């Protein structure tokens, strides 16, 4: 089909239960792209849902949202292709892994990163959309270093709000919970992978390393709020963006 004819596959970038993402070079324009292939549901109503979802996402233009290029269908069982700007190999998880000391995690740089994520989320919320899948392995950097919120719309539960885990009804407030943990994680580097999971699961339960609360008193209170078991109590993305910790 169009994919094999117009593109040269380079490598596989990711494989969820949803679909697959490939790096592919367009033969005509010579640029490399990230192309997600999704198996389309056989049922009529489920297909219409997905096709409306595509039409909503295609309208999205924001500094913190990956640039969209094209979407199309191909028959084998039908597949939906979505062609997006190719971000860097190193995602936010990799970024944090390569910087394991306090000196390597400068306050300003970390907050500038978090702010861009938070602004992308605020933009989606204001449109009536939620992200649902905010985690460091799904947060990207463009070639020119702009932070991008990852794949969404159509893995660990470590960043997933309690209500979202339990299959309970939920709102945009789920993204705020995810934001809290990411803010903590940006400011608190880890020696080992096991320390990371040990500490993060505690932070989910509102139990904080005493060195974090003393070094980051303001953002501690903020993270505490964003991590309420009760979604109503979590602040709006706009409130977080306008918080005093992002003054300068
Ligand atoms: N863009 C990417 N660059 C490098 C590696 C990877 S791994 C996954 C992606 C990626 C990122 C974002 C998105 C996708 C793959 C598919 C759809 N999409 C979105 O952000 C959703 C969206 C679709 C259409 C318009 C706006 C947003 C990736």
UniProtKB/Swiss-Prot annotation:
ATP binds at residues 13-21, 36. The active site is at residue 133. Autophosphorylated at Tyr-33 following endoplasmic reticulum stress, leading to activate its activity. Dephosphorylated at Tyr-33 by PTPN1/PTP1B, leading to inactivate its enzyme activity. Belongs to the protein kinase superfamily. Ser/Thr protein kinase family. GCN2 subfamily. Forms dimers with HSPA5/BIP in resting cells. Homotetramerizes in response to endoplasmic reticulum (ER) stress, leading to its activation. Interacts with HSP90B1/GRP94. Interacts with DNAJC3; inhibiting EIF2AK3/PERK activity. Interacts with ATAD3A; ATAD3A and EIF2S1/eIF-2-alpha occupy a common binding site within the cytoplasmic loop of EIF2AK3/PERK, leading to prevent EIF2AK3/PERK association with its substrate EIF2S1/eIF-2-alpha. Interacts with MFN2. Interacts with TMEM33. Interacts with PDIA6. Interacts with LACC1. This is Eukaryotic translation initiation factor 2-alpha kinase 3. The modification Phosphotyrosine is found at residue 33. The lumenal domain senses perturbations in protein folding in the ER, probably through reversible interaction with HSPA5/BIP. The insert loop specifically recongnizes and binds EIF2S1/eIF-2-alpha. Metabolic-stress sensing protein kinase that phosphorylates the alpha subunit of eukaryotic translation initiation factor 2 (EIF2S1/eIF-2-alpha) in response to various stress, such as unfolded protein response (UPR). Key effector of the integrated stress response (ISR) to unfolded proteins: EIF2AK3/PERK specifically recognizes and binds misfolded proteins, leading to its activation and EIF2S1/eIF-2-alpha phosphorylation. Induction: By endoplasmic reticulum stress. It comes from Homo sapiens. Ubiquitous. A high level expression is seen in secretory tissues. Coiled coil: none annotated. Changing residue 72 to S: In WRS; uncertain significance.
């Amino acid at each position: 089909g169009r994919y094999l004819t117009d593109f040269e596959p380079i490598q596989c970038l990711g494989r969820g239960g949803f679909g697959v993402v490939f790096e592919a070079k367009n033969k005509v324009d010579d640029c490399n792209y990230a192309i997600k292939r999704i198996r389309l549901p056989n049922r009529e109503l489920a297909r219409e849902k997905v096709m409306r979802e595509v039409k909503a996402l295609a309208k999205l233009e924001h500094p913190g949202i990956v640039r969209y290029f094209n979407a199309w269908l191909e028959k084998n069982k039908v597949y939906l292709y979505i062609q997006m700007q190719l971000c860097r190999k190193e995602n936010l998880k990799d970024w944090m892994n390569g910087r394991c000391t306090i000196e390597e995690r400068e306050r300003s740089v970390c907050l500038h990163i978090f702010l861009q994520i938070a602004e992308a989320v605020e933009f989606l919320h204001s449109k009536g959309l939620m992200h649902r899948d905010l985690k460091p392995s799904n947060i990207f950097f463009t070639m020119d270093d702009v932070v991008k919120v990852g794949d969404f719309g159509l893995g660990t539960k470590l960043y997933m709000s309690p209500e979202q885990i339990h299959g309970n009804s939920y709102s945009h407030k789920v993204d705020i919970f995810s934001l809290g943990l990411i803010l903590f994680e940006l400011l608190y580097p880890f020696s080992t992978q096991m320390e990371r999971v040990r500490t993060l699961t505690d932070v989910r339960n509102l139990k904080f390393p005493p060195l974090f609360t003393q070094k980051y008193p303001c953002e501690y209170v903020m993270v505490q709020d964003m991590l309420s078991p009760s979604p109503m109590e979590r602040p709006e993305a706009i409130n977080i963006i306008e918080n005093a910790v992002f003054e300068d």
